[PDB]
Amino acid sequence: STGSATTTPIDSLDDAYITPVQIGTPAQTLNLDFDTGSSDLWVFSSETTASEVDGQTIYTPSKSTTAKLLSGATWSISYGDGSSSSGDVYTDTVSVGGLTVTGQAVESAKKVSSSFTEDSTIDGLLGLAFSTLNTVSPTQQKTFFDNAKASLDSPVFTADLGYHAPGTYNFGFIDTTAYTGSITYTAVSTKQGFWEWTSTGYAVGSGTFKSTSIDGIADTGTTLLYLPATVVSAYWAQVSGAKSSSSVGGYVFPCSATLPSFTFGVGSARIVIPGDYIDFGPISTGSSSCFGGIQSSAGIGINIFGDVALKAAFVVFNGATTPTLGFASK
Numbered sequence: 001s002t003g004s005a006t007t008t009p010i011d012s013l014d015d016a017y018i019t020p021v022q023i024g025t026p027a028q029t030l031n032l033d034f035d036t037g038s039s040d041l042w043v044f045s046s047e048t049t050a051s052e053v054d055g056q057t058i059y060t061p062s063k064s065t066t067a068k069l070l071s072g073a074t075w076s077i078s079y080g081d082g083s084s085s086s087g088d089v090y091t092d093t094v095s096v097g098g099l100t101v102t103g104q105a106v107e108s109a110k111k112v113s114s115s116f117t118e119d120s121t122i123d124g125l126l127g128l129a130f131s132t133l134n135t136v137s138p139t140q141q142k143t144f145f146d147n148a149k150a151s152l153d154s155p156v157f158t159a160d161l162g163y164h165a166p167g168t169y170n171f172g173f174i175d176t177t178a179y180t181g182s183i184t185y186t187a188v189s190t191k192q193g194f195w196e197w198t199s200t201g202y203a204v205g206s207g208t209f210k211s212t213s214i215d216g217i218a219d220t221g222t223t224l225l226y227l228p229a230t231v232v233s234a235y236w237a238q239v240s241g242a243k244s245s246s247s248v249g250g251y252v253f254p255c256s257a258t259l260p261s262f263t264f265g266v267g268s269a270r271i272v273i274p275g276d277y278i279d280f281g282p283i284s285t286g287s288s289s290c291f292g293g294i295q296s297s298a299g300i301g302i303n304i305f306g307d308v309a310l311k312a313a314f315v316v317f318n319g320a321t322t323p324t325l326g327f328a329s330k
Helices: 114-118 144-151 229-236
Strands: 003-009 017-023 028-035 041-043 068-078 084-096 099-112 124-127 156-160 167-171 184-187 196-204 210-218 225-227 243-245 250-254 262-266 269-273 279-282 289-292 294-296 303-305 314-318 324-328
Touching: 003 084, 028 041, 041 084, 068 099, 099 144, 184 196, 196 229, 210 225, 229 250, 229 294, 250 294
Parallel strands: 028 124, 041 099, 210 303, 225 294
Antiparallel strands: 003 017, 003 167, 017 028, 017 084, 041 124, 068 084, 084 099, 156 167, 156 314, 184 324, 196 210, 196 262, 225 303, 243 250, 250 289, 262 269, 279 289, 314 324
16 A cells, blocks of 8 residues: 655744644544654544644544544653643544554543644644654554554655645655655664664855764654754854854844755765755844754754755655665755
8 A cells, every 4th residue: 555645834934744634434634743753643632621722623533433542541742842742542543645544543632732732733743753752651552654564565654845835745655756866775773763864974055075974863843954063053154144042042144144055965965955945034023133944953962854954855764674764856
């Protein structure tokens, strides 16, 4: 089997992407944030504290003939940005882009933090990291991908995120029309439960390539590119007036600037992030200070190849017995 679903930016900044997902019988379609940096499929629901729901579409398990309470199971997750959610668990039928999993754990939120409430466009998350990170207790549950894997034509999914435009998540096949040149594959460590890999270096604008190993994660659920302070300083030094602002919470730059590109290495291959992809616009409405899309990972504890990086590539998440990651230009 295969699946193919369009993913759409939630706003004009590409802060996140939503993909429609069918849950239950008859189908209830919720727009979920596919997150290769976590491993829980959770939704706003009829059980979510009413004051914490503000415009989201909810899953109502009582209206699904295929929903079953997973008795005794609870979940609770905290994300890198400090947001969180928790609740109980149902199993139900879940379909993405025509690919159906029966018996998928659907984690029903009883509580969500303010960041989730305030984002009316995101009805929940669909985790695509390794199932070892799943938070369901006392019986850990599998991700949608892990459940689907055996049925897939090939044990892969691909992320093709757009810049200020829709893109695609495919399951079970590689669309050879969706990228240019060849796909370069690179080793993955699953030791921390992430799609963790080592970039071979970087360049700033038209500058020379610096060969240096940068360990990080491919994370569709993180907006920006978080890299070591040395690398980030080298980038922003090429933008007149750019500075790190503790009051704002990272590097800002004059909105009048033209940003240089940023290149990262995948083996001997190179992925170029255009400068425009690094512009996250005014820090506050009407400001002439703009927020940068490349930020320091210092104090996160891990480098993160988030959407800023991934949307410059066609990315293969290869879940074969020895997982790997593939990157192609597009």
